[PDB]
Design an enzyme around this catalytic site. Structure first.
Site, mmCIF file in Angstrom:
data_model
loop_
_atom_site.group_PDB
_atom_site.id
_atom_site.type_symbol
_atom_site.label_atom_id
_atom_site.label_comp_id
_atom_site.label_asym_id
_atom_site.label_seq_id
_atom_site.Cartn_x
_atom_site.Cartn_y
_atom_site.Cartn_z
ATOM 1 N N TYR A 37 -10.578 -4.409 5.933
ATOM 2 C CA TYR A 37 -12.039 -4.427 5.896
ATOM 3 C C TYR A 37 -12.660 -3.526 6.938
ATOM 4 O O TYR A 37 -11.978 -3.065 7.869
ATOM 5 C CB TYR A 37 -12.581 -5.865 6.068
ATOM 6 C CG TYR A 37 -12.525 -6.395 7.480
ATOM 7 C CD1 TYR A 37 -11.339 -6.911 8.003
ATOM 8 C CD2 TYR A 37 -13.660 -6.391 8.285
ATOM 9 C CE1 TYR A 37 -11.307 -7.385 9.283
ATOM 10 C CE2 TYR A 37 -13.622 -6.868 9.575
ATOM 11 C CZ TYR A 37 -12.434 -7.366 10.061
ATOM 12 O OH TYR A 37 -12.354 -7.845 11.356
ATOM 13 N N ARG A 60 -11.564 4.996 9.660
ATOM 14 C CA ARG A 60 -10.691 3.881 10.001
ATOM 15 C C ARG A 60 -10.304 3.118 8.752
ATOM 16 O O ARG A 60 -9.172 2.671 8.636
ATOM 17 C CB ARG A 60 -11.346 2.943 11.028
ATOM 18 C CG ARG A 60 -10.362 1.847 11.484
ATOM 19 C CD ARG A 60 -10.910 1.005 12.646
ATOM 20 N NE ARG A 60 -12.115 0.285 12.265
ATOM 21 C CZ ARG A 60 -12.869 -0.363 13.148
ATOM 22 N NH1 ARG A 60 -12.512 -0.378 14.430
ATOM 23 N NH2 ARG A 60 -13.970 -0.993 12.759
ATOM 24 N N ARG A 113 1.569 -13.833 -9.092
ATOM 25 C CA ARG A 113 1.852 -14.036 -7.667
ATOM 26 C C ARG A 113 3.297 -13.671 -7.328
ATOM 27 O O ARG A 113 4.230 -14.261 -7.866
ATOM 28 C CB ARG A 113 1.563 -15.486 -7.254
ATOM 29 C CG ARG A 113 1.937 -15.749 -5.816
ATOM 30 C CD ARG A 113 1.569 -17.144 -5.338
ATOM 31 N NE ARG A 113 1.823 -17.233 -3.895
ATOM 32 C CZ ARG A 113 2.998 -17.563 -3.365
ATOM 33 N NH1 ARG A 113 4.027 -17.843 -4.158
ATOM 34 N NH2 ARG A 113 3.141 -17.586 -2.039
ATOM 35 N N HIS A 115 5.339 -11.597 -3.655
ATOM 36 C CA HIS A 115 4.930 -10.982 -2.378
ATOM 37 C C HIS A 115 4.956 -9.445 -2.389
ATOM 38 O O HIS A 115 4.130 -8.810 -1.737
ATOM 39 C CB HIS A 115 5.827 -11.445 -1.212
ATOM 40 C CG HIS A 115 5.641 -12.873 -0.770
ATOM 41 N ND1 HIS A 115 6.018 -13.959 -1.537
ATOM 42 C CD2 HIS A 115 5.206 -13.382 0.408
ATOM 43 C CE1 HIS A 115 5.767 -15.074 -0.871
ATOM 44 N NE2 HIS A 115 5.276 -14.752 0.315
ATOM 45 N N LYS A 160 -6.980 -3.130 10.450
ATOM 46 C CA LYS A 160 -8.138 -4.067 10.388
ATOM 47 C C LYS A 160 -7.997 -4.832 9.103
ATOM 48 O O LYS A 160 -8.539 -4.469 8.089
ATOM 49 C CB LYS A 160 -9.445 -3.280 10.538
ATOM 50 C CG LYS A 160 -10.575 -4.238 10.982
ATOM 51 C CD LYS A 160 -11.853 -3.418 11.311
ATOM 52 C CE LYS A 160 -13.025 -4.287 11.850
ATOM 53 N NZ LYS A 160 -12.618 -5.139 12.991
ATOM 54 N N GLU A 192 -7.163 -7.725 23.455
ATOM 55 C CA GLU A 192 -8.522 -7.632 22.966
ATOM 56 C C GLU A 192 -9.051 -9.010 22.601
ATOM 57 O O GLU A 192 -8.362 -10.028 22.784
ATOM 58 C CB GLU A 192 -8.584 -6.668 21.762
ATOM 59 C CG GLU A 192 -7.736 -7.134 20.560
ATOM 60 C CD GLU A 192 -7.809 -6.170 19.395
ATOM 61 O OE1 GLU A 192 -8.765 -5.381 19.355
ATOM 62 O OE2 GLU A 192 -6.886 -6.184 18.552
ATOM 63 N N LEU A 216 -6.706 -3.250 18.174
ATOM 64 C CA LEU A 216 -7.415 -2.469 17.170
ATOM 65 C C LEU A 216 -8.262 -1.422 17.884
ATOM 66 O O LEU A 216 -8.983 -1.760 18.834
ATOM 67 C CB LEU A 216 -8.312 -3.361 16.313
ATOM 68 C CG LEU A 216 -8.940 -2.515 15.202
ATOM 69 C CD1 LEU A 216 -7.939 -2.266 14.079
ATOM 70 C CD2 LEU A 216 -10.231 -3.071 14.669
#
Lengths: 296, 296
Positions: A37, A60, A113, A115, A160, A192, A216
């Site tokens: 995101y 980014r 579903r 992985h 992110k 962070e 990040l």
């Protein structure tokens, strides 16, 4: 007025009221946290709204997508156009003078579903524009409280990602302790916050941890480098150990929604004299100049 | 016949065709990976389907929920009834003789986006029953291939969470290397697979890592302890370093969907003679007896 959001699933896109926006249950964003995101600040001057550092945010986003093997569904111009349309669609919901954030989420899409990456995945894209409340006068004048905790996050913090349960736990920890943020430490060194980067000031010098997979790289990392140089403040990239954090002259947070914010209490103890310092003051002013310069 | 799934959002529940099941975009399962899950195997004998070790799975679900502060929306009987109704609803979609897995996901629910826990959250519950293909004859006879990689996951691996991007990357790594699983190592010691637990055999003794926050305690951990005792096989809980893994007489995987499975190639090298060993054979037979005993 209800927010209007953007949703693209299985290559079918819509702009719809938030109450009508739903994703299939087998989206890997929902099942696996398999997505990334961005949060882009959008500043208002009356009815005019403009993004801040959106080129750098989109770069980014591209890095986050590549790091987890999702093909980027737009060129930069396409992303910019999407954001502009979304912000325009929300003019009435936001109202004149109202700053916004644009939230962009991209997931690997919907599949049976399992992985591993599904063959021929079509990424899901979700984007929303919601009101942004910047830190208040009072918060800038008094500063905020942070607590510290051990960093128990994964070791791909350079992505992110929306697999954010570890960050959620740290944000909740902060809230339970009447704190704005949890400053994490790993191997005795600052990493962070749950959703912000951390800086200290010691003897007039601005200090931040080096770029790495434990931290990040905020869009504010490059920005604050620029601002420090403008202000004639020496910037040093260096590990900050716990002792150095607690003895700092100033502690600062940065993020899209915080801009730059002074931390004046740490684990219920005052930071130096408990008031925001002169490096915060200078950098904050420089941030406001940067906003005016780049957008107006 | 389309699968029928269960979905409860904002205390409103439905049993609907998979194609009709959608969650609000602001569900924290989608936005933050803020949720936990279970996978329960359901074995078929003709039209009769029964769960295996469902008490133990539900106890783990309760532990995962408590570990991230989500109130459990059902008592054990309620969960059992939900699973039974869901499996019944899928009788036609599955067909006689078809084993199933029941997937249960619980998230913190829908709210304005903010990392800390929302006040008065109503958890979302999603559950699906889909066909289970156990490892084949061929896979049990030949064994499977695993690769190894550094464990870069977070340090709350005791929670069965849906923030699974790190596990997704390891599963994809395995797939890219023609492998069934990636065995992770941290500080030079075995932790676990992307979605399975790891065991070795050396000099007739079964060995597994100790319970910890680096390793999810599989429902098969207690089960295999039981099976080893039944078979007269010494079980030792102990750290396994990389050298011990590579020199093992046997390497085994366990999970709900794998049952117990022999690993006969590791990073493209044969494990001992490259064929499944006698401890695998004994434990696998004992597993089948346990299934028959507990369900029939």
């Amino acid at each position: 007025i209800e927010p209007i959001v953007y949703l693209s699933v299985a290559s079918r896109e819509e702009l719809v009221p938030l109450s009508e926006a739903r994703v299939p249950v087998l989206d890997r964003g929902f099942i696996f946290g398999d997505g990334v995101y961005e949060v882009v600040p959008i500043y208002a001057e009356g009815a005019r709204r403009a993004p801040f550092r959106i080129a750098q945010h989109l770069a980014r986003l591209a890095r986050s997508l590549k790091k987890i093997g999702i093909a980027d569904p737009h060129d930069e111009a396409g992303w910019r156009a999407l954001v502009a349309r979304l912000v325009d669609a929300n003019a009435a919901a936001l109202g004149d003078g109202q700053h916004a954030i644009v939230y962009i989420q991209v997931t690997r899409g919907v599949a049976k579903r399992g992985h591993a990456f599904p063959a021929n995945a079509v990424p899901t894209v979700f984007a929303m524009a919601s009101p942004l409340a910047l830190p208040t006068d009072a918060q800038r004048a008094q500063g905020v409280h942070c607590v510290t905790a051990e960093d128990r996050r994964w070791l791909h913090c350079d992505i992110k990602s929306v697999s954010l349960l570890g960050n959620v736990l740290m944000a909740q920890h902060a809230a339970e302790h009447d704190a704005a943020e949890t400053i994490q430490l790993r191997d005795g060194n600052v990493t962070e916050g749950s959703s912000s980067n951390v800086w200290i000031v010691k003897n007039g010098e601005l200090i931040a941890p080096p770029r790495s997979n434990r931290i990040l790289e905020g869009i504010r990392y490059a920005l604050v480098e620029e601002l420090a140089e403008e202000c004639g403040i020496r910037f040093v990239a260096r590990e900050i150990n716990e002792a150095e954090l607690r003895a700092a002259d100033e502690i600062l947070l940065t993020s899209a929604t915080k801009e730059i914010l002074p931390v004046t209490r740490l684990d219920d103890l005052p930071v130096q004299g408990g008031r925001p310092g002169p490096v915060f003051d200078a950098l904050y002013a420089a941030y406001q100049r940067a906003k005016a310069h780049e957008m107006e």
